Design a protein around this ligand. Structure first.
Ligand SMILES: COc1ccc(CN2CCc3c(c(C(=O)N[C@H](CC(=O)O)c4ccccc4)nn3CCO)C2)c2ccccc12
Length: 64
């Protein structure tokens, strides 16, 4: 069964794949994901898993 970390990342992946979401800016999505309890590293992992890679620095800059 999945760890809580795995559940967060999986939920994020399914989110980032939605067609409406894909049209929403990166910054809004990153703030959203942080509101669901994802760390910057977990957010960065989800973006890579869907083939929309972002640097960790980019995600950190949004969250700062
Ligand atoms: C920041 O921009 C937005 C946030 C939310 C929504 C609403 N839903 C879009 C589709 C969607 C959502 C969610 C979602 O919020 N899932 C959970 C919520 C929960 O269980 O608390 C979740 C997502 C990410 C991380 C953790 C949990 N999942 N999916 C895909 C499967 O339907 C949320 C948006 C819809 C259109 C465009 C932008 C959206």
């Amino acid at each position: 069964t999945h760890s809580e970390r795995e559940k967060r990342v999986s939920n994020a992946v399914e989110f980032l794949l939605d067609s409406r979401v894909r049209r929403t800016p990166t910054s809004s999505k990153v703030h959203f994901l942080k509101s669901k309890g994802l760390s910057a590293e977990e957010i960065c992992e989800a973006f890579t898993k869907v083939g929309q890679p972002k640097t960790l620095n980019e995600i950190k800059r949004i969250l700062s």
